[PDB]
Amino acid sequence: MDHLPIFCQLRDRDCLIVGGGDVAERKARLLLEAGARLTVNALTFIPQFTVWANEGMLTLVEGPFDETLLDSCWLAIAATDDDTVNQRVSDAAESRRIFCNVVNAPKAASFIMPSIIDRSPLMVAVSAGGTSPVLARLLREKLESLLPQHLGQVARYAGQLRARVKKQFATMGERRRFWEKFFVNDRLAQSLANADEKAVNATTERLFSEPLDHRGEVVLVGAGPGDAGLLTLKGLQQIQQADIVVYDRLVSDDIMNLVRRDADRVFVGKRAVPQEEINQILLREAQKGKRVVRLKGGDPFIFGRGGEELETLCHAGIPFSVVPGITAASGCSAYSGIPLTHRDYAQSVRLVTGGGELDWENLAAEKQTLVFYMGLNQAATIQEKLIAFGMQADMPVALVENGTSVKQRVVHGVLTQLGELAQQVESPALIIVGRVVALRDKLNWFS
Amino acid sequence: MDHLPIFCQLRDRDCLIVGGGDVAERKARLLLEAGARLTVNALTFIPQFTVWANEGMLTLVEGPFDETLLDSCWLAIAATDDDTVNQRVSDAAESRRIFCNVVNAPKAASFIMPSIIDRSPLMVAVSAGGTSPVLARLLREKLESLLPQHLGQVARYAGQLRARVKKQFATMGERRRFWEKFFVNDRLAQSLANADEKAVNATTERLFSEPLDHRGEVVLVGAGPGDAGLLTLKGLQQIQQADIVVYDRLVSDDIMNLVRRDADRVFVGKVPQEEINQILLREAQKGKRVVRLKGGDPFIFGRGGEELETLCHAGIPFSVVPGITAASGCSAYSGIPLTHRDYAQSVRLVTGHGELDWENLAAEKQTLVFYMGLNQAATIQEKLIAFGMQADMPVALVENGTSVKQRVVHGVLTQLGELAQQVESPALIIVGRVVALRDKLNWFSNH
Ligand SMILES: Nc1ncnc2c1ncn2[C@@H]1O[C@H](CSCC[C@H](N)C(=O)O)[C@@H](O)[C@H]1O
Ligand SMILES: Nc1ncnc2c1ncn2[C@@H]1O[C@H](CSCC[C@H](N)C(=O)O)[C@@H](O)[C@H]1O
Ligand SMILES: [Cl-]
């Protein structure tokens, strides 16, 4: 072992930073977050130090490095640009047996500052001894995406409950299985976050009363339009903790690979399937006691037929929640370079399908952006009947197929070519109509 | 944070353990592995301690607690069963400003010993500070399953190439891009694992020979409506690697916790557009990774349709990460789907601050979403009524959607004026029959 990691309790302990630049500012902010009583010594200070001082959060000593400021210090940080000054700081702290960090020379120091994931009281720290800062940040970013930030509140509720858990589950296996359920229960985490005490004690005793086997809930998760990177953090966390994932073909293969592999997969899609038995699959599995995730393309509440499922769940007592996704309009907008609103261009955006009878006097009006979902089929009926209501023959139209994926194709023309453009593409495609289409020239970044 | 993690260099520094039992043994084993000059002072020793003193790896001091043995120490550990003795030790350590650990007492000591995952020279440390030891074990065991066995060899080799990387690459960014490609080359990993030197050398020379890009870029990232879990995975990648992050009023404080600690932050808030652009323009022209962080989605009422031409006119590469828009975030979190089987089959996103076409907005069977229409709410009510919307149409106002401070008021269209006086910005107005579904779909809390 090259370094001993220790977690230091710093509240009202004296600490010294030498330096007054932005490096020293980052260090000072960490130590203030830790509750340190902080003195800063520097020849000059960036103004963020004088505001912290005015608000009585630190102490400033303008001048050269004064070894006697270390006199009652627990930690020293040399954060200047002068290796000479840092070495004098480092040497003065060594003789007083004060742990000292040198920002630019981590080998010169008696301690190193690692990358930190703060879910306090829960804390994770990563370092490789200075050999690889970029590896630490790479690991920090993956850790950040996996640990929900309300985990800390769940942590402290746990500690206040270990007497009840131990007095109810005899074996340690029984206890670990309970804790494993406790720490991934999301109505619990949301209730502690939102400070709803009725829902905490409700969820608390529902956790104690149901069998250790059971953990029935259903989560409606938006997978977004295609790109695995457009999943939400909450979404990725939910499909990692799931026992069964129910998915359609509108969920891209890359999203599916993010499903941790001991989960059961249920495909409920096209081949070459009514929503009614989909409701009963979800119903069945939740009442067997499984964490069911329903993955849907895009956003669940935008042409998802996703509300119809949940009111069946609400009438059986099955807890549920919903994680929104990037809808196709927003993804294709961004990946094709067509903003949906802009300036003098479009006051409003309209999301519509292609069922029943629509109102095309309404759809034809100007100063709009029109986005057609599932419109490819009735597409010819759309060109002739927007022009037949006075909308200009020169209005740019665009079709985005497979938006946000590496197979994205965009065809753009003018309203009077709308049918011709149409089956140069296939489903799934969006039809976008309006002046905003004309700014793809200046705004397309996706190669 | 409640603790401050640090990685101490203990080689040739005196440490003192008080206690000579199995708990003292496990802490002694750790300090020995970190190179400490160890002294153990106890009435009695388990046999492993005498086996260590015979090899000259520690000094044993038999007898009761001697305070003077602290004099030259950098760390102290109270590991007796006697809690009176442990307190005399932590007292004697306090006065000397020596970080001290008390085994049966996490809240009583100035440092905590964390769980360690070791991939030397890489190291991950996990602690919940004694509030939840079992969360720390479950997490440590999950981390153990995500860190590849042979990651330590990749880190070690990185340590040996730093001198060469810094000599051959002038700028910080060029070094970062080298390391970014180094740490995700699968083949270099397996070659290091198999001690295949010629294969390591061939990939290494080729990696050093690659042309490295020298451009800064501006990334527009959607933060989503507030909840930090609603950021996309890509958006998190961006704000964890960014050099500077330009952000607004409407980026919640929990998203900012995701911004990399070493990044610079610039706030905007009446700061008009032409100063933002030239801030963006001048920062990227210096080769820095620039993230523009905006609330919701950048291309929906984002004003971000002209930021991008100024950059395209300048030769600055740019990209766009879509975000969850306030409509689909507030929809999911108030229990109000934007579309539904027989309630609404089109969604209209409208602004507030010729003018609006009210005959079209008042049309049947659509959901209306008003962005920043709080100050204009009495007009919206008047106009929709005059163009034929029924007086009893359900309306809802979502304030601070997806945040811990979310508030929803709701009612009928003849109440829309009065309702707006009960909330403040930022807030959405949802108009349509879907609003009535909240009483069957609200899985979120009570405001
Ligand atoms: N990746 C994609 N690219 C282009 N259009 C897409 C798309 N994904 C979905 N669509 C559109 O959405 C239709 C399915 S309706 C499902 C909508 C989804 N819940 C959402 O919010 O996006 C398809 O017929 C197609 O018109
Ligand atoms: N968390 C939230 N809850 C309710 N309304 C919100 C909100 N965040 C933004 N808004 C609305 O959005 C307006 C800002 S316009 C920018 C919104 C962003 N581009 C998006 O896609 O959502 C505010 O006036 C408010 O009406
Ligand atoms: Cl490192």
Numbering used by the authors:
A (entry chain B): 1 to 272, 277 to 358, 363 to 455
B (entry chain A): 1 to 270, 277 to 359, 364 to 457
Sentences from the paper on this structure:
Siroheme is the modified isobacteriochlorin tetrapyrrole used by siroheme-dependent sulfite and nitrite reductases (SiR/NiRs) in catalyzing the six-electron reduction of sulfite to sulfide or nitrite to ammonia. CysG is encoded by a gene fusion between a C-terminal SUMT (CysGA) and an N-terminal bifunctional dehydrogenase/ferrochelatase (CysGB). The N-terminal enzyme module, CysGB, is a three-domain bifunctional dehydrogenase/ATP-independent class III ferrochelatase12 that performs the final two steps of siroheme biosynthesis. The C-terminal enzyme module, CysGA, is homologous to a well-studied class of SAM-dependent uro’gen III methyltransferases (SUMTs) that catalyzes the methylations to generate precorrin-210,13.
D104 has been implicated in its chelatase activity but its exact role is unknown. Alteration to asparagine results in an enzyme with a severe growth defect, 10-fold lower dehydrogenase activity, and 200-fold lower chelatase activity. The D104N variant is also sensitive to addition of Co2+, but with the same dose–response as CysG. The D104A and D104N structures were determined to ensure that there were no gross structural defects that arose from the alterations that might impact their function. Indeed, both altered enzymes were crystallized and the structures are largely similar to Met8p. The asparagine side chain is pointed away from the tetrapyrrole binding pocket, toward the Rossmann fold, as D104 does in the apo structure. Presumably, in the D104N altered CysG, the asparagine can reorient and partially act in the same capacity as the aspartic acid in catalyzing dehydrogenation and chelation. Asparagine rarely serves as a nucleophile, but there are some examples of proteases that use an asparagine in this capacity, so it may be sufficient to allow basal catalysis. It may also be sufficient to coordinate the water molecule that is poised over the tetrapyrrole nitrogens to prepare the tetrapyrrole for metal insertion, albeit less efficiently than the aspartate. As regards metal ion specificity, however, D104N is no more sensitive to increasing cobalt dose than CysG, suggesting that metal ion specificity does not depend entirely on the nature of the ligand that recruits the metal to the tetrapyrrole.
